[PDB]
């Protein structure tokens, strides 16, 4: 039998409740076969290729596409050639908020240098004992948790003075 | 980013964890315009038309389609023109078990007599004070919770010696 919109919403609520255990991860520091034409993300993958590291999520919330007039005086978001508004968990069903917003910044020299081509967000990550910092290389992690969301990109590069900001907007059902 | 196969598994696990608050509901006690094939359900709605009542779920579990020979001897189920197996929550990501199974039965005089044309499953239902019984009419419910799945259905009788019964196998996404 078929899905409902009410379920997409309650399942987005559940992934927002996990926010404390959520980290950005980036990977794929050597070329694609074709640097203009990356492949699709194979959904059964559990970790990025050539993992660079992890950074704690700076933001996790429900969102919905922004609409006038009622969002003319609410918390705006701009993403992916689209416009959005924040939704609190106790308003999710009334607002229709089945979309999750995820974001972090990897700043300066706090994680390994050079190029990157893979990006994603995990949940249930745990560091090794005595490590409390929010930036981690794979040898400082004790458990990587579960990779909820990831995608491929064409390459970008960091020198030691330069920053990578990485994010996604996601929903449990991709197309209809 | 993509919503992965294992994200659908973790979301199916969450819905199964709610089992103690799960109720069958039935409705639509008056005809459609024609009875052979009624229209698609309007997934913006949160309650059945012409609600008859609620009955506590007898069974809530993960499932998956089976593969021969070795699954043909296990905790077997049949639904949706396919053979199925039961899966427990701690095996879910090894088995690939993104499908949720829901079921209840109605016997004797415990709810209104006749025929019905809508079916659904709710979580988070609560009865009015002192009412501990598993069969509830809409005036005995204090909160209806969230209607998770519902649909329009071909009718059957219930009378003084006949068991009525309803079930679903359901998931978070119709097709990626």
């Amino acid at each position: 039998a078929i899905a409902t919109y009410n379920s997409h919403v309650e399942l987005a609520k559940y992934l927002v409740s996990k926010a404390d255990s959520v980290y950005l991860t980036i990977g794929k520091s050597t070329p694609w076969s074709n640097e203009t034409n990356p492949p699709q993300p194979d959904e059964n993958a559990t970790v990025l290729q050539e993992v660079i590291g992890y950074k704690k999520a700076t933001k996790v919330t429900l969102v919905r596409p922004s609409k006038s007039p009622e969002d003319d005086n609410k918390n705006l978001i701009s993403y992916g050639n689209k416009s959005w508004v924040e939704v609190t968990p106790e308003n999710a069903k009334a607002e229709g908020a089945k979309w999750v917003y995820l974001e972090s910044s990897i700043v300066g020299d706090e994680l390994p240098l050079g190029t990157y081509r893979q990006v994603g967000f995990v949940m249930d990550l745990v560091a090794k004992s005595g490590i409390s910092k929010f930036n981690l290389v794979p040898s400082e992690v004790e458990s990587t948790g579960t990779l909820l969301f990831f995608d491929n990109k064409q390459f970008q590069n960091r020198s030691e003075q330069t920053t990578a900001k990485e994010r996604f907007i996601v929903e449990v059902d991709p197309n209809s | 980013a993509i919503a992965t196969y294992n994200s659908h598994v973790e979301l199916a696990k969450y819905l199964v964890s709610k089992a103690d608050s799960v109720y069958l509901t039935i409705g639509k006690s008056t005809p459609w315009s024609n009875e052979t094939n009624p229209p698609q359900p309007d997934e913006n709605a949160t309650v059945l038309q012409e609600v008859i009542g609620y009955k506590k779920a007898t069974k809530v579990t993960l499932v998956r389609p089976s593969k021969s020979p070795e699954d043909d001897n296990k905790n077997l189920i049949s639904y949706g023109n396919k053979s199925w197996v039961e899966v427990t929550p701690e095996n879910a990501k090894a088995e690939g078990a993104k499908w949720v199974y829901l079921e209840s039965s109605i016997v004797g005089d415990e709810l209104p007599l006749g025929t019905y044309r809508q079916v659904g499953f709710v979580m988070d239902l609560v009865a009015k004070s002192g009412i501990s019984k598993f069969n509830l009419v809409p005036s005995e419910v204090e909160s209806t919770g969230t209607l998770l799945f519902f649909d329009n259905k071909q009718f059957q009788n219930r009378s003084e010696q006949t068991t009525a019964k309803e079930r679903f196998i359901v998931e978070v996404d119709p097709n990626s």
């Binding site: - | 002192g130 009412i131 501990s132 019984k133 009419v137 005036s139």
Partner: protein, 58 residues
């Protein structure tokens, strides 16, 4: 609705049953007590509804 689990009132107007006949050395049922008061008030209601209406001052 008093037909449900906390009270289990067994009264129903359509059965035309007007008296609960108790028997000796049997376990007493609260449902019988509820029906006992339900009946005689129901016939007082029919007696009232043959004279009055649900909107009359006396």
């Amino acid at each position: 609705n008093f037909k449900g689990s906390p009270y289990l009132d067994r009264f129903d107007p359509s059965k035309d049953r007007t008296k609960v006949l108790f028997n000796p050395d049997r376990p007493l049922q609260q449902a019988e007590l509820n029906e006992m008061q339900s009946i005689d008030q129901y016939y007082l209601k029919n007696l009232g509804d043959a004279i009055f209406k649900d909107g009359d001052k006396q």
